[PDB]
């Protein structure tokens, strides 16, 4: 059958595996990457944000971006043939059509990649725990680039695809959401930093508990992929950390499962918190301390200090960060400390 | 400060004075911890996926490993076969020692830089400053994302320690 | 007649310690928000 | 500090219930 013939070709052993998932992955991923490279090189953001964001305009690698569509577009798909662009490619770029282009094709790209992980794992004969782990980056992408702006007024308040643009997104979430005070980001931080810890401490331990399987000072040559023996001493590695740290791994399988668990769980937790922020459901305040501080002008914590910083961030960045609001702040209304 | 909120206070004030985000050393630190978490999840998933069956469905797979056993609990050949096809084979590790070294090297080196980042910004060698870098023909300032970052930094600056400043320039 | 699908349940000491740690730390984190 | 009156009970149950669940599972394992 033609289906079986095509299946043979798609699953051919090549330098770059394709598979059925390749029909979805490769074009979408190529357009997402290409769309970003195109926009950050030529396309501007002058009509959407009032910002320059391409090499053609004078921006560097850190400042270039594919910016979000104007707030007036709402949650429009902004299709090229859509009622906004009306088939005009030039107008389409000027309206922010490339952002949705990247976001959407990038979304189905991530779907194609996770499918690719399933497909290859099925052909090889291994468990699909790599695909499962990849659910955490997806949950992050979906919550932040799709769900969060959908919860808000428009795509405008989604992250713009750029280095400095992301930094804007970071500081925005501090000033407006107090995202640092949210326990769901905290669990994410613990997962990322904890993942980096596990990654560093595992590689270091293994490398420093190696068996002597060679005569050379560089021990990389003393390994063979088809060997049946462990290359490092689990026993010696166990005693070391038992005396240094108090506890230690005794089971290799639980160790590498835990290395999956920590950063994946963290990202999923941070994803949940973003979903909340989409509705402005923030961990912004502690009511108990606001009651105290409002009644007692001598009560002060690092928490009340950070809120003053958020108030500063908001009032000072909003007019330019949200040009569609037409904010006009007279100098006398700006929150300022002494001298500065 | 030795506290959770105090830590956040340290980060916010730092950004307003050093622009640590636009500093290539914090960016290497971010690449070190994101990559660390990635590779940690990556190594964890590939080894778990290539675990040799020693147990049934009614028990944990962890009991397929005994402490101090001679044999490796997983198949690196199969694992490399998978990840080598996920991208291309020459982008995958067949050497467990070389692989694990990379696992140690990447986040350590990354954190080394972000450590030096704080250490160098301590002597006020701050992050990249592209404020008003783009200018049109007439002379009007064409803002970028950097200028928006600046506006946010202005907000922290003028508000941080609202009573401690008596002079217009924040030096100490 | 007994049910042949029944199975014993286990939880070793290590899983207990890990589990208790997960709970105690989650408690320490979220308690402040409960009291608010 | 004027905190939530349910903060104490919600925190106490959040600790006790799942931790008890674990303790129960452990003791019946060592007895096996």
């Amino acid at each position: 059958g033609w289906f079986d013939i095509l299946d043979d070709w798609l699953k051919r052993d090549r330098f770059v595996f394709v598979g059925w998932s390749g029909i979805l992955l490769f074009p979408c991923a190529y357009l997402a990457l290409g769309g970003w490279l195109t926009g950050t090189t030529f396309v501007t953001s002058w009509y959407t944000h009032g910002l320059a964001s391409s090499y053609l305009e004078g921006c560097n690698f850190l400042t270039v971006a594919v910016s979000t569509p104007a707030n007036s577009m709402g949650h429009s798909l902004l299709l090229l043939w859509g009622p906004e662009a009306q088939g005009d490619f030039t107008r389409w770029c000027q309206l922010g059509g490339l952002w949705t282009f990247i976001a959407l094709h990038g979304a189905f790209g991530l779907i194609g990649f996770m499918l690719r992980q399933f497909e290859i794992a099925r052909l090889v004969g291994v468990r699909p725990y790599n695909a499962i782990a990849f659910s955490a980056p997806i949950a992050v992408f979906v919550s932040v680039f799709l769900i969060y702006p959908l919860g808000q007024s428009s795509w405008f308040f989604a992250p713009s695809f750029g280095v400095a643009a992301i930094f804007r997104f970071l500081l925005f979430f501090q000033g407006f959401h107090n995202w640092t005070l949210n326990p769901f980001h905290m669990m994410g931080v613990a997962g990322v930093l904890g993942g980096a810890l596990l990654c560093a401490i595992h590689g270091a331990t293994v490398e420093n508990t190696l068996f002597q399987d060679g005569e050379g000072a560089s021990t990389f040559r003393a390994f063979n992929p088809t060997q049946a023996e462990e290359t490092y001493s689990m026993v010696t590695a166990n005693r070391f950390w038992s005396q240094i740290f108090g506890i230690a791994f005794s089971n290799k399988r639980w160790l590498h499962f835990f290395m999956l668990f920590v950063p994946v769980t963290g990202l999923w937790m941070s994803a949940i918190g973003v979903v909340g922020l989409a509705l402005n459901l923030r961990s912004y305040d502690f009511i108990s301390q606001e009651i105290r501080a409002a009644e007692d002008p001598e009560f002060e914590t690092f928490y009340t200090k950070n809120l003053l910083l958020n108030e500063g961030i908001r009032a000072w960045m909003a007019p330019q960060d949200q040009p569609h609001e037409n904010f006009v702040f007279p100098e006398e209304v700006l929150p300022r400390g002494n001298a500065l | 400060p030795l506290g959770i909120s105090g830590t956040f206070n340290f980060m916010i004030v730092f950004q307003a004075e050093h622009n640590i985000l636009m500093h290539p050393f914090h960016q290497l630190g971010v690449a070190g911890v994101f990559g660390g978490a990635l590779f940690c999840a990556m190594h964890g998933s590939l080894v778990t996926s290539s675990l040799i069956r020693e147990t049934t469905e009614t028990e944990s797979a962890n009991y397929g490993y005994k402490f101090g056993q001679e044999e490796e609990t997983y198949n690196i050949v199969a694992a490399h076969g998978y990840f080598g096809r996920l991208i291309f084979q020459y982008a995958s590790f067949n050497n467990s020692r070389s692989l694990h070294f990379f696992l140690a090297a990447w986040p350590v080196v990354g954190v080394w830089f972000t450590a030096l980042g704080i250490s160098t910004m301590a002597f006020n060698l701050n992050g990249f400053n592209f404020n008003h870098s783009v200018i049109d023909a007439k002379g009007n300032v064409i803002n970028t994302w950097a200028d928006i970052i600046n506006r946010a930094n202005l907000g922290m600056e003028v508000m941080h320690e609202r009573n401690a400043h008596n002079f217009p320039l924040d030096l100490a | 007649e007994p049910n042949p699908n029944r199975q014993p349940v286990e939880l070793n000491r290590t899983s207990l310690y890990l589990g208790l740690l997960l709970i105690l730390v989650l408690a320490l984190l979220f308690s402040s928000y409960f009291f608010n | 500090m004027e905190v939530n009156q349910l903060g104490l009970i919600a925190t106490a149950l959040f600790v006790l219930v799942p931790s008890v669940f674990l303790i129960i599972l452990y003791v019946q394992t060592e007895s096996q």
């Binding site: 166990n238 230690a248 | - | 000491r13 310690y17 | 106490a12």
Partner: peptide
């Protein structure tokens, strides 16, 4: 009462450390 709760949890964690180290499940070869 908030303080007592916070300290109690912290105390339990420290106690858990002691049992997870000195009264752990001994790894056997």
């Amino acid at each position: 009462m908030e303080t007592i709760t916070y300290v109690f949890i912290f105390a339990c964690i420290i106690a858990l450390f002691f049992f997870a180290i000195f009264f752990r499940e001994p790894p056997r070869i």
